[PDB]
Design a protein that fits this description.
The structure is cut from a larger assembly and holds 3 copies of chain A, 1 copy of chain B (about 230 residues) and 1 copy of chain C (about 220 residues).
Chain A (H helix, E strand, L loop, with lengths): L13 E4 L17 E8 L5 E7 L8 E2 L4 E6 L5 E7 L8 E6 L4 E6 L3 E7 L5 E4 L8 E4 L7 E10 L2 E10 L11 E5 L7 E6 L11 E5 L3 E9 L5 E6 L4 H8 L36 H4 L13 E3 L25 H4 L7 E3 L16
Antiparallel strand pairs in A: 1-3, 2-17, 3-16, 4-15, 5-12, 5-16, 6-7, 6-15, 7-8, 8-11, 9-10, 12-13, 13-14, 17-18, 19-20
Chain B lengths: L2 E3 L10 E6 L10 E6 L5 E7 L14 H6 E4 L8 E4 L53 E8 L7 E11 L5 E4 L9 E2 L3 E2 L5 E10 L9 E6 L4 E6 L3
Antiparallel strand pairs in B: 1-2, 2-6, 3-4, 5-6, 7-8, 8-12, 9-13, 10-12, 11-12, 13-14
Chain C lengths: L3 E2 L14 E2 L2 E2 L12 E6 L5 E5 L13 E4 L6 E4 L9 E6 L23 E5 L3 H5 L2 E11 L5 E6 L3 E2 L3 E5 L9 E10 H5 L4 E6 L7 E5 L5
Antiparallel strand pairs in C: 1-3, 2-7, 4-5, 4-8, 6-7, 9-10, 10-14, 11-12, 11-15, 13-14, 15-16
Classes of the chains: A mainly beta (about 350), B mainly beta (about 230), C mainly beta (about 220).
Bound molecules: 2-acetamido-2-deoxy-beta-D-glucopyranose (7 copies).
One 2-acetamido-2-deoxy-beta-D-glucopyranose (NAG) binds next to loops of chain A.
Protein name (chain E): Spike protein S1
């Protein structure tokens, strides 16, 4: 049961900046007052994050899940409830369901038949899916929850793990540093190629308050993290952003003295490969052994040794009228790739179902 | 397909169960269809079903009559398929072939239409009848030989088998010793639903008065064996 | 649905000369990427139908090379090099769309071999058959060719219909001659009121029909 | 693993990887239990870095596995009186198969120039082929039950460990310990560090 | 190598500086009845030293 909405206003998405957002803990190891570099998914600094606002605005786009995403929301009075994760969002596949109820948080994943506009509506109306047929995993979690609250979320799918990160802090995107401590590492182990956020509407039609949210992306980069005595992240450095941070990260120091430093090298990568045809691809013919008027008998089979030539399986009925060509051993696709020597060909005629008898063992 | 099970005297208000028994054959990963034949000139496709390996959905392709009173159900564990009929409105005779679809792939097929390549594994062994006719012992009628044919020295005699049901009856001459002139016509259907058979054998008239001709009629469903001698 | 018309459904064919069969589909089948959506089916009478040509103009299922089908547009035909004794079986046409599939009308495929002289036999009812209350008389044809024939019953020069049934065997492997037996049954009251009973056979190889007449009173 | 060593008559570690006799003190993480049946001598094809038929297009193993396979022979449960053709394997593919994933797709493979619309025609074949299993077959055709176990180590806490829980913590003593499978020797004191729950 | 024999019956050390010789004999080691005169240990509390 779902209700279609036709009151949506057409508005192209806006773009804002991501100065110092999108940094978390790549491992749970405790390191204090040291600088470490790790290779993991990281949102690049000064990236181009999409601005979505809802008010009357009903922005609920369906964006594909190419990689991990970063969710930021300047949320007031808890309008947002959850997100939808899946491949095609139907009963033919298993899709993750994140729904925040009145008081708790439940994590469910089944073959939900999601509608075009999944949304919620005191709160006693929930129209996101019709029914689910078969599923195994269900989880129950603690409740995670002028603008006064800022919430940041990171969703990642690495090695089948739904590493969801949560952080709430009191307050365009503000400029500052906020640690994203991991909360739940759920071993989901499913395919995810799309995602969509959920929203809750208030009934007075429906009335929506002033709210906004951000969606980001995760990229493979090397980040230099500096820790303190308390064991928290202070700042991050991206080597691929600008040469200054490259010099900072290669020297393992946040302060670079005056001078010249050799840190990396400049190079270009090839885009193709070149192998030309040396011709002379036909040396010996198999027509005299495969296309002949007279063939040898089973008791006296002719022994022919073929060498110092080529083996072309392209003109001796390579396509074939699907006879009993199926056999065990070397496939014809790799037969030319197989660098066999001294091929032996013995031809004879049989009767009926004696093809089975010509087999090893 | 090597043997089939099902087929009998079932009332139209009852339930019909048909199945195919198979052997070592690519049955699990092949689409299955049913074909039945009419006693007249012509056939018509009745049912089809796909496999769960290629897609989760079953690709139900039905005509109006089989939406009306037919259903299908696979097993995905053994080499068999179960066909169940809840009701029988008008279905007198059917063969219910077990043909195989020569298609290992599916492409551009929706719930409305889907191409089919060919069939090459038609099977015999299912015969359904709704005539509601019971069985009874056969009757053997001796026919006097006559020399009215082109050859005056040869006389044709035979044992007439009437009022027998069902069709399978074995007629032999001299317990199979006589092999010349042996001829057995197939059964025919009357208005009462019974069957009639005529079997004759040609013998010379010189040995008619000396050699004794005794016909053996065996009816396996009725467990009746009648030996009749033909005399002028 | 799709209707199928087989124009050469009844024709005598002789060995050594090619025969053609055609089928017509109501809907156009030009939507094809080099694969004609039509195939032919051969039904051997008695054991199982067989497959000769599948979708497209190719060969599969171990069909002999004498079978060849072709067509593109509003034209479909099947070419045979030479029909033999193993080619006895009706043909059917099919297209690869319209999932409520419907077969065409059946043929007969009566191969025109040499003409065999029929042997007219008659079997008067026995005394015990008349005592049973039902009298049955059979007119038999032995080793007749071609299989097509017209069998009727005349009682006192009056045509009898609605009570005569005929049965025909398959082609023999020794002489390849068919045989037909026609059985006529009547009640005892209807049998005792008539004396002259006869059966007539109309044959293609006979200039005039033959009639065997017998009376009541003799064994 | 102690009961599992005698539950089934399987081959005793015909593989390279983790220590067999020391398997009690292995706190591995995130196993992937995959079970399938093969024919003949295809057990040797399931090896890290091996190139063959199954190892190329059906199930490929990477250079580093940190584990091995477990195989045993079963000629009774997987074989019937009639033909047992319930197993299919893919031998035709467009290109190589990346490891640690399964690509199920019933599609027509083309070998000639012209393509096919899902019809096995002249040069168009099918990758899936059946397994011929009979109780009277030889060693080279017996059905073999092979299960693969991967024992990769991750930084995540181990949800499985051997039953070696005893003793108690001792403070201010330079003693040896094997905490979480990591052998070490040192004193066990306290500190003022603040540790996050994760 | 690790096996039932290699862990409970006879264990080989890390270094051997050699190898073994083996051969098959189904004639002198088999009788008409059950030749059940050879036994092997299967249960042990701990490992066996080489
Ligand atoms: C972000 O992208 C939009 C359009 O894709 C572009 O107009 C804008 O300048 C971009 N901003 C940055 C900081 O790259
Ligand atoms: C809490 O969530 C569960 C879903 O697990 C739902 O069944 C229940 O109704 C919710 N509670 C309230 C008060 O809505
Ligand atoms: C999945 O659910 C459907 C109900 O629509 C049921 O018919 C089917 O058997 C279920 N499959 C499994 C594997 O549980
Ligand atoms: C996940 O889905 C995408 C797109 O639907 C597909 O390309 C990919 O192969 C899938 N992954 C697996 C492991 O099947
Ligand atoms: C680190 O911990 C000490 C002791 O609890 C505390 O006084 C100090 O404020 C902490 N540092 C920060 C940045 O909060
Ligand atoms: C064919 O081979 C000859 C040498 O035998 C060479 O000169 C020529 O370039 C080759 N053709 C092509 C198309 O490469
Ligand atoms: C065999 O060779 C002859 C002439 O040499 C040719 O006509 C025929 O097509 C060839 N057959 C095959 C199968 O190559």
């Amino acid at each position: 049961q779902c209700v279609n909405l036709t009151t949506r206003t057409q508005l192209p998405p806006a773009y804002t900046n991501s100065f110092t957002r999108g940094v978390y803990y790549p491992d749970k190891v405790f390191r204090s007052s040291v600088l470490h570099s790790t290779q993991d998914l990281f949102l690049p600094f000064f990236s181009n994050v999409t601005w979505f606002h809802v008010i009357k605005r009903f922005d609920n786009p369906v964006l594909p899940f190419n990689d991990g995403v970063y969710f930021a929301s300047i949320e007031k009075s808890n309008i947002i409830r959850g997100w939808i994760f899946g491949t095609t969002l139907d009963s033919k596949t298993q899709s993750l369901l994140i729904v925040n109820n009145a008081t708790n948080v439940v994590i469910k994943v089944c073959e939900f038949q999601f509608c075009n506009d999944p949304f919620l509506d005191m709160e006693s109306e929930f129209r996101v899916y019709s029914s689910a047929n078969n599923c195994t995993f269900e989880y129950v979690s603690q409740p995670f929850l002028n603008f006064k609250n800022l919430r940041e979320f990171v969703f990642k799918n690495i090695d089948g793990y739904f590493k969801i990160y949560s952080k709430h802090t009191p307050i365009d995107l503000p400029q500052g540093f906020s640690a994203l401590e991991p909360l739940v590492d759920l071993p989901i182990g499913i395919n995810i190629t799309r995602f969509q956020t959920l929203l809750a509407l208030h009934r007075s039609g429906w009335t929506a308050g002033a709210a906004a949210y951000y969606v980001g992306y995760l990229q493979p980069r090397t980040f230099l993290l500096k820790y303190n005595e308390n064991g928290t992240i202070t700042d991050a450095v991206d080597c691929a952003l600008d040469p200054l941070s490259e010099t900072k990260c290669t020297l393992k120091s946040f302060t670079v003295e005056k001078g010249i430093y050799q840190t990396s090298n400049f190079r270009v990568q090839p885009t193709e490969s070149i192998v030309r045809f040396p011709n002379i691809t036909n040396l010996c013919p198999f027509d005299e052994v495969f296309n002949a008027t007279r063939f040898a008998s089973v008791y006296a089979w002719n022994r022919k040794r073929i060498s110092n030539c080529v083996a072309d399986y392209s003109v001796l009925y390579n396509l074939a009228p699907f006879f009993t060509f199926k056999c065990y051993g070397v496939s014809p696709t790799k037969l030319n790739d197989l660098c066999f020597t001294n091929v032996y060909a013995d031809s004879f005629v049989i009767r009926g179902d004696e093809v089975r008898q010509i087999a090893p063992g | 397909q090597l043997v089939e099970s099902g087929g009998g005297l079932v009332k139209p208000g009852g339930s019909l169960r048909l199945s195919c028994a198979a052997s070592g054959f690519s049955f699990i990963t092949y689409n299955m269809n049913w074909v039945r034949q009419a006693p007249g000139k012509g056939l018509e496709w009745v049912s089809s079903i796909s496999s769960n390996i290629l897609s989760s959905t079953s690709y139900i392709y039905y005509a109006d009559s089989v939406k009306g009173r037919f259903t299908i159900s696979r097993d995905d564990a053994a080499n068999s398929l179960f066909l169940q009929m809840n009701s029988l409105r008008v279905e007198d005779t059917a063969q219910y072939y077990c043909a195989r679809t020569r298609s290992r792939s599916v492409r551009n097929c929706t719930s409305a239409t889907c191409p089919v390549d060919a069939f090459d594994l038609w099977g015999q062994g299912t015969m359904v009848i709704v005539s509601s006719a019971s069985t009874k012992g056969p009757s053997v009628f001796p026919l006097a030989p006559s020399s009215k044919s082109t050859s005056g020295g040869t006389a044709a005699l035979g044992c007439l088998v009437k009022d027998y049901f069902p069709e399978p009856v074995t007629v032999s001459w001299n317990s199979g010793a006589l092999t010349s002139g042996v001829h057995t016509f197939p059964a025919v259907l009357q208005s009462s639903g019974l069957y009639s058979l005529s079997s004759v054998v040609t013998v010379p008239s010189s040995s008619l008065g000396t050699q004794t001709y005794i016909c053996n009629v065996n009816h396996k469903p009725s467990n009746t064996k009648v030996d009749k001698k033909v005399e002028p | 649905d799709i209707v199928l018309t087989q124009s050469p459904l009844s024709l005598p064919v002789t060995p050594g000369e090619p025969a053609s069969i055609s089928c017509r589909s109501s809907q156009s089948l030009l939507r094809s990427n080099g694969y004609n959506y039509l195939d032919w089916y051969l039904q051997k009478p008695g054991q199982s139908p067989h497959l000769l040509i599948y979708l497209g103009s190719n060969r599969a299922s171990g069909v002999p090379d004498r079978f060849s089908g072709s067509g593109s547009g509003t034209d479909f035909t099947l070419k045979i090099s030479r029909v033999e004794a193993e080619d006895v079986g009706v043909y059917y046409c099919m297209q690869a769309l319209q999932t409520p599939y419907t077969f065409g009308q059946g043929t007969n495929l009566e191969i025109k071999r040499t003409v065999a002289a029929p042997s007219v036999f008659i079997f008067p009812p026995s005394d015990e058959q008349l005592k049973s209350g039902t009298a049955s008389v059979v007119c038999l044809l032995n080793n007749f060719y071609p299989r097509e024939a017209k069998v009727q019953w005349k009682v006192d020069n009056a045509l009898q219909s609605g009570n005569s049934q005929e049965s025909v065997t398959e082609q023999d492997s020794k002489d390849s001659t068919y045989s037909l037996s026609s059985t006529l049954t009547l009640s005892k009251a209807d049998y005792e009121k008539h004396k002259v009973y006869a059966c007539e056979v109309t044959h293609q190889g006979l200039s005039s029909p033959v009639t065997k007449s017998f009376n009541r009173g003799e064994c | 693993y102690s009961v599992l060593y005698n539950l089934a008559p399987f081959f005793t570690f015909k593989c390279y990887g983790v220590s067999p006799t020391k398997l009690n003190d292995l706190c591995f993480t995130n196993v992937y239990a995959d079970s399938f049946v093969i024919r003949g001598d295809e057990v040797r094809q399931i090896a890290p870095g091996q190139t063959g038929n199954i190892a190329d297009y059906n199930y490929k193993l990477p250079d580093d596995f940190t584990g091995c396979v477990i195989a045993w022979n079963s000629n009774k449960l997987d074989s019937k009186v009639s033909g047992n053709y319930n197993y299919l394997y893919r031998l035709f593919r467009k290109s190589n198969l990346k490891p640690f994933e399964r690509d199920i797709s019933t599609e027509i493979y083309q070998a000639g120039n012209k393509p096919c619309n899902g019809v096995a025609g002249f040069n168009c074949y099918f990758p899936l082929r059946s397994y011929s299993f009979r109780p009277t077959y030889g060693v080279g055709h017996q059905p073999y039950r092979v299960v693969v176990l991967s024992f990769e180590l991750l930084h995540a806490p181990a949800t499985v460990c051997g039953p070696k829980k005893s003793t108690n913590l001792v403070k201010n003593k330079c003693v040896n310990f094997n905490f979480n499978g990591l052998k070490g020797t040192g004193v066990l004191t306290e500190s003022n560090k603040k540790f996050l729950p994760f």
